[PDB]
Write a protein that binds this ligand. Structure first.
Ligand SMILES: *[C@@H]1O[C@H](CO)[C@@H](O[C@@H]2O[C@H](CO)[C@@H](O)[C@H](O)[C@H]2NC(C)=O)[C@H](O)[C@H]1NC(C)=O
Ligand SMILES: *[C@@H]1O[C@H](CO)[C@@H](O[C@@H]2O[C@H](CO)[C@@H](O)[C@H](O)[C@H]2NC(C)=O)[C@H](O)[C@H]1NC(C)=O
Ligand SMILES: *[C@@H]1O[C@H](CO)[C@@H](O[C@@H]2O[C@H](CO)[C@@H](O)[C@H](O)[C@H]2NC(C)=O)[C@H](O)[C@H]1NC(C)=O
Ligand SMILES: *[C@@H]1O[C@H](CO)[C@@H](O[C@@H]2O[C@H](CO)[C@@H](O)[C@H](O)[C@H]2NC(C)=O)[C@H](O)[C@H]1NC(C)=O
Ligand SMILES: *[C@@H]1O[C@H](CO)[C@@H](O[C@@H]2O[C@H](CO)[C@@H](O)[C@H](O)[C@H]2NC(C)=O)[C@H](O)[C@H]1NC(C)=O
Ligand SMILES: *[C@@H]1O[C@H](CO)[C@@H](O[C@@H]2O[C@H](CO)[C@@H](O)[C@H](O)[C@H]2NC(C)=O)[C@H](O)[C@H]1NC(C)=O
Ligand SMILES: *[C@@H]1O[C@H](CO)[C@@H](O)[C@H](O)[C@H]1NC(C)=O
Ligand SMILES: *[C@@H]1O[C@H](CO)[C@@H](O)[C@H](O)[C@H]1NC(C)=O
Ligand SMILES: *[C@@H]1O[C@H](CO)[C@@H](O)[C@H](O)[C@H]1NC(C)=O
Ligand SMILES: *[C@@H]1O[C@H](CO)[C@@H](O)[C@H](O)[C@H]1NC(C)=O
Ligand SMILES: *[C@@H]1O[C@H](CO)[C@@H](O)[C@H](O)[C@H]1NC(C)=O
Lengths: 463, 394, 463
């Protein structure tokens, strides 16, 4: 028999402490190890589009209720118009999103793209295996339109359980998506074609058209990793990168919260339809939920007392339903704006903002189709094995106080490396990689009291 | 319909929903039966009971024609709560119950199913969970096998004294139950205002049963009343009106796409299919979690599945710039489409026919459409998308 | 007359493909033509503010109502409180927006401002010609409060059809706007005068006070257009710019989506009032929609039953109305925050993040007053006539692989121009335009294997 549950304190991780130091030099923390890793997000962009029939939902061809309904015919008109406007908004958001997805130009894409990088995202020319894994993991009901109506009809299995056949009972109509999944696949491939790249200035006109690996090295130097390290570790980088990518095959689990959100987007749509269906059986104190039954059992002077009760409650349900749809539609529109923003930042370029994208600085990110939205993956850079080193605010010529320099995108640290005869060395800011100080990694600055006074050998300036 | 919904003669161009087709219903089949005529002979002789002595007849498995019974008496009061009297005669049920009794018509002012009179306070009540009817009637001079009470009688009080001799507990009669006081009251009340008592058993905590009653003079023709209630059910509905099944000419196993039906008095409409036979066997019907019939067992040994019938969604493409329109029938596909519809939607669709009387229907990936023309053009934005890659050009 | 509609596939506009080459050099796509163009957007910032007399809407002061409502008097207080708070929020949002709109300093503005640019947005020294074009195209009823009482009253024309005078029947009050339109116009003139400075190390502390054209040229070098080209094409630039500007006079049609949004904001405000008005005639099963009718024909034991039923439905519609206002007010506040963000980014300065503003990189944008909000216009750059050229990652001295170079905000391309004797040439990235390579266009970089080896003539540096 399993053990009793155990009460426990919530752990609090403590940040690595770095003691403050006085004077002209200071302690510096730098990682000596790193790993690629990924994060994911799901941004819903749409609400499934439906319409209803205030003439088929309330009653079903009984002439007595039709005449009663006429006194309320304007409520249906309000219902229909409201739903119609909601659907127009959904189509607006789709077009607006795609307008930013498209690029004026892109690379062609072939198998083996990305060189040593594995790139499982490539299409089976298609959508992609990753998108299909998502769709398989999703528990959503079998699709509408074709064959449609004939899966309600006896020409099919008795085991069908689709609410879609109930679509033809309840008066529901499910409108088709505007986007067409094949066009959708074309749009996501177009985004992959914009890769390599964003670097090289704005990237808003020109298209670099360079190998994928090269764009990666460019991004790595954009985060303060020295160029020398990048050339030495090229295969290592690809190996760590593909380990992170390979983990995506385990990413389709219930502990993946982005995945969970996708499933709940599906769940919410299904629930809304089920609510209207269940209400068809809801008496309002009426003798029966069936109009024809109460007609058959009652003299007409009393018959429509029962019909009236039934009609009013049915209308009330429809009104509540519409209000809910309008709210959800608006939340989707706002969510779609966010998706558009990330496409124009997190995907189309490396970003310096932190915040957006996965939390590991930023390096290239990717996006794929997901039901009712976009699913993002963010490659990130996670530091490890931080060490503490001595560093100086800057250096100057002790023979001439106006000769003062400071490192660019890096630090001056006391050398701890046997290759360098010089007492100080430059390092990248993202990684511990000391190197000799040269003019390429430094700039002249105004003098400051904290700069070290070097009385001997400084190559930048030599004098 | 669209113009009326927008209260205007100029609806903005777009695609709009319109009401769906009713899907073409067809003539009925039934699986009711069987049984034998419900013997109503207990009413044909002897003296009917005092208001606290009711006779009851439970009817199951049997057939009836209540108008035959109506011919036997003159009815001086007909009323039915929660059901038309015509329907209760024509309805088929899991049970039919008849209560019958002597009743002077001098007391008819005090009797209705909702009455506050002493007859309902202490002698009889009916549940409102079931529809009810009431009949008051008298005996014809040729029905003399039925005979009169010495006097009509009733209990006008029923209470129990508390054992402490200071208070008393009233006992109104429970619906569908004899009053407790019947155990002490005599088969008739010997004199108006007679009262009776019985000591309560110690298991009851002591005290005394108390009851009293009143009488009404005997009349030239016997006067009587009836109470009727019915019970709903599914595969228990063996009580039915006498039925004739000639020239259906067939029932279950004859299809059909939308047919009216009744099974053991359970109405519905739908199409059936020959299928497996999930359990429980012999349970009559089969239902989903929403209490909608799923399918039904039959005496041909065949389980039938039921799909109800399938309505057809409709939408309309409207181009106000050219003042033209076209339509889409949705997922239904052109295989169920015909030049006219009995299914039906609105009294005409001739405005579509202004061009489409001259052309065949066109299938599309979304669905069958009328008056679209397959141009195979590629256009970036129709401002009238049909969904997917479909696009109707103005 | 016209024939049948034509079914068509939705076209998919393919990006221009660029081949992915596999060596030390690559194809580069660069536009050879461009045009100015504009986009517009409407951001609502406020909703119309209303209050409702909670006694007058329910009844006309008939005394039976005056006593009957005492039982429900707390409902009215809740209604008034909720509406009052909603109006306070609208005023808060307006003040907050203007607090950042204002500038500490601006240029004086004169006719002929902006030089050769037409600048039709200038006030007719009033509001502006553009603002009036918008207001004339808008179908909204003329505002009251000076006085407009006599368009209700017998002292005026029989043709008034204003909801405004229906406000004196129903007890509605539309609140006057928080600010005089003239003050608001003054704030946007300050925004016009806030241009130039456009930058230079935040510019919150300074004002450059330079010609509009001059500030534009700095914006143009901000996107990689070379200066030499700009100096030779200045008149050409002015012409293209004014063609884009002139199109705004044709932009105010229902085919303009931003314009359409403005009209619907107006429609919604009027719509809310009409809903309440229509309910005055809505019986709730009461013998008449009029209280006085109910009073005139009934004995008080029945009369009061009829009146209470009538009252209950009237209060119910007021409650739903309040909820509707609370929702809309909140969405307006959020929208106003967005506008504030754009004014302090997309308008006051050039932005490099893309997404925002018009989709053509970014160059100066303008904003004008619009009903219930701000209307933005964004000037942008659209590239055209892209060509592919050969380009290199960098260039080098083959005799000394210990100092190499790479272009700044441009590319090194093989020369195709008869004017330039050099094997390689610098180009701007926004526009194709070869130039000799000089130190102004380059930076020193660490060497890489993909850099070209020049064994002879390379002047930047010669040594
Ligand atoms: C940097 O750290 C990583 C992990 O912390 C090291 O990776 C090793 O990876 C293999 C493969 O999963 C593991 O089995 C080993 O246990 C890992 N080693 C350690 C020490 O965790 C990687 O070798 C490190 N790189 C360095 C120190 O240069
Ligand atoms: C990298 O891409 C290769 C294909 O080049 C993938 O290898 C295939 O993976 C699928 C999925 O399990 C297998 O069915 C195939 O048999 C594999 N190919 C071969 C030749 O064995 C691989 O999964 C991708 N990912 C990684 C991390 O290597
Ligand atoms: C040598 O280092 C000192 C501090 O480490 C430099 O700074 C001087 O500090 C004193 C004490 O506050 C000040 O009075 C001087 O004004 C500082 N110098 C300057 C230039 O401001 C000192 O400059 C260094 N000597 C050099 C670089 O020759
Ligand atoms: C370069 O771009 C300009 C600006 O778009 C082009 O000039 C316009 O071309 C269109 C093409 O139909 C004409 O309708 C306009 O009247 C032209 N305007 C002006 C001011 O010339 C020009 O044709 C382009 N040149 C090339 C070679 O592409
Ligand atoms: C901008 O330039 C346009 C020319 O396209 C001017 O518009 C015309 O101005 C003349 C005045 O001589 C009028 O007669 C025309 O009717 C105008 N054309 C129109 C309205 O299409 C305009 O005045 C200039 N505006 C500014 C601010 O310079
Ligand atoms: C000349 O260009 C080549 C590439 O075309 C430069 O790169 C060398 O390439 C070979 C083969 O890939 C490597 O083995 C060398 O290590 C590369 N050189 C360096 C410095 O890494 C080559 O350097 C250039 N020669 C010069 C500049 O003298
Ligand atoms: C440490 O910093 C303080 C800051 O006030 C300064 O006064 C002092 O000179 C520094 N050095 C020592 C040794 O305290
Ligand atoms: C005999 O009758 C009464 C209850 O009816 C009570 O006084 C007594 O307990 C009964 N005898 C027994 C043995 O229960
Ligand atoms: C159809 O029903 C009959 C019994 O009526 C049965 O014998 C037969 O197997 C059924 N066919 C199918 C395909 O279920
Ligand atoms: C319509 O035209 C397309 C164009 O190729 C053709 O493929 C298709 O068969 C045609 N018919 C239908 C019903 O789509
Ligand atoms: C060039 O082609 C070879 C294979 O022939 C490939 O290994 C190498 O990575 C390519 N260079 C790139 C993509 O820069």
């Amino acid at each position: 028999v399993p053990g009793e549950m155990r009460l426990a304190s919530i752990a609090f991780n403590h940040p690595i402490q770095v003691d403050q130091l006085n004077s002209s030099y200071f302690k510096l923390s730098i990682p000596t190890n790193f790993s690629f890793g990924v994060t994911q997000e799901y941004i819903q962009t749409t609400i499934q589009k439906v319409t209803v029939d205030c003439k088929q939902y309330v009653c079903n061809g009984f002439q007595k209720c039709e005449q009663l309904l006429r006194e309320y015919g304007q409520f249906c008109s309000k219902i229909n118009q409201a739903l119609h406007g909601a659907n127009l908004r959904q189509d607006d958001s789709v077009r607006n999103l795609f307008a930013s997805v498209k690029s004026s130009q892109s690379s062609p894409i072939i198998p083996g793209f990305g060189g040593d990088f594995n790139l499982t995202l490539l299409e089976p020319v298609a959508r992609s295996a990753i998108e299909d894994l998502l769709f398989d993991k999703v528990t959503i009901a079998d699709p509408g339109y074709m064959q449609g109506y004939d899966d309600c009809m006896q020409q099919g299995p008795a085991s069908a359980r689709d609410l879609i056949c109930a679509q033809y009972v309840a008066g529901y109509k499910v409108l088709p998506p505007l986007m067409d999944v094949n066009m959708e696949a074309a749009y996501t491939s177009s985004l992959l074609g914009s890769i390599a790249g964003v670097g090289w200035t704005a990237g808003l006109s020109s298209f670099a058209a360079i190998p994928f690996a090269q764009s990666i090295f460019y991004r790595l130097n954009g985060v303060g990793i020295t160029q020398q390290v990048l050339s030495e570790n090229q295969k290592l980088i690809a190996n760590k990168f593909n380990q992170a990518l390979g983990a995506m095959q385990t990413g389709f689990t219930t502990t993946n919260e982005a995945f969970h959100k996708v499933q709940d987007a599906v769940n919410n749509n299904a629930q809304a339809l089920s609510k209207l269906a269940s209400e068809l059986s809801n008496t309002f104190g009426a003798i029966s939920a069936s109009i024809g039954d109460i007609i058959q059992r009652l003299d007409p002077p009393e018959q429509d007392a029962q019909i009236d009760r039934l009609i009013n409650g049915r209308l009330t349900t429809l009104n509540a339903f519409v209000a809910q749809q309008l709210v959800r539609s608006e939340s989707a529109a706002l969510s779609a704006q966010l998706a558009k923003d990330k496409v124009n930042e997190c995907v189309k370029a490396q970003s310096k903002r932190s915040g957006f994208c996965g939390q590991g600085t930023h390096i290239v990110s990717f996006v794929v189709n997901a039901p009712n939205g976009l699913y993002f993956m963010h490659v990130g850079y996670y530091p490890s094995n931080h060490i503490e080193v001595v560093s100086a605010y800057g250096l100057c010529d002790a023979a001439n106080p106006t000769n003062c320099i400071a490192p660019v995108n890096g630090y001056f640290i006391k050398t701890n490396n046997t290759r360098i005869v010089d007492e100080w060395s430059y390092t990248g800011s993202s990684f511990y990689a000391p190197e000799p100080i040269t003019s390429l990694n430094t700039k002249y600055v105004a003098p400051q009291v904290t700069y070290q006074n070097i009385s001997t050998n400084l190559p930048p300036p030599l004098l | 319909q669209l113009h009326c919904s927008y209260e205007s003669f100029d609806v903005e161009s777009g695609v709009y929903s319109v009401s769906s087709f009713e899907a073409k219903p067809s003539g009925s089949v039934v699986e009711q039966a069987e049984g034998v005529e419900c013997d109503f002979s207990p009413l044909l002789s002897g003296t009917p009971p005092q208001v606290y002595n009711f006779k009851r007849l439970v009817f199951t498995n049997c057939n009836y024609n209540l108008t035959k019974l109506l011919s036997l008496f003159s009815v001086n009061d007909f009323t039915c709560s929660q059901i038309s009297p015509a329907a209760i005669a024509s309805n088929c049920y899991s049970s039919l119950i008849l209560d019958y009794f002597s009743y002077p018509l001098s007391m008819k002012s005090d009797l209705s199913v909702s009455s506050a009179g002493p007859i309902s306070q202490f002698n009889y009540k009916q549940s409102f969970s079931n529809p009810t009817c009431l009949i008051l009637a008298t005996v014809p001079h040729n029905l003399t096998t039925i005979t009169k009470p010495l006097k009509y009688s009733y209990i006008n009080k029923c209470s129990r004294f508390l054992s402490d001799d200071r208070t008393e507990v009233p006992q109104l009669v429970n619906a569908n139950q004899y009053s407790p006081c019947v155990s002490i009251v005599p088969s008739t009340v010997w004199e108006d205002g007679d009262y009776y008592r019985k000591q309560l058993s110690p298991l009851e905590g002591g005290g005394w049963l108390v009851a009293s009653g009143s009488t009404v003079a005997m009349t030239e023709q016997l006067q009587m009343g009836f109470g009727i209630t019915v019970q709903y059910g599914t595969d228990t509905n063996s009580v039915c009106p006498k039925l004739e099944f000639a020239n259906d000419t067939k029932i279950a196993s004859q299809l059909g796409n939308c047919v009216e039906y009744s099974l053991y008095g359970v109405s519905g409409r739908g199409v059936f299919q020959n299928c497996t036979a999930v359990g429980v066997r012999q349970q009559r019907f089969v239902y989903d979690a929403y209490q909608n019939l799923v399918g039904y067992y039959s005496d041909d040994g065949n389980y039938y599945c039921l799909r109800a019938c399938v309505s057809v969604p409709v939408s309309v493409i409207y181009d106000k710039e050219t003042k033209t329109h076209a339509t889409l029938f949705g997922s239904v596909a052109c295989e169920h489409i015909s030049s006219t519809m009995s299914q039906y939607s609105r009294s005409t669709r001739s405005m579509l026919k202004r061009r489409d009387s001259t052309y065949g229907p066109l299938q599309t990936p979304v669905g069958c459409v009328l008056g679209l023309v397959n141009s195979s053009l590629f256009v970036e934005d129709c401002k009238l998308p049909l969904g997917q890659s479909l696009c109707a050009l103005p």
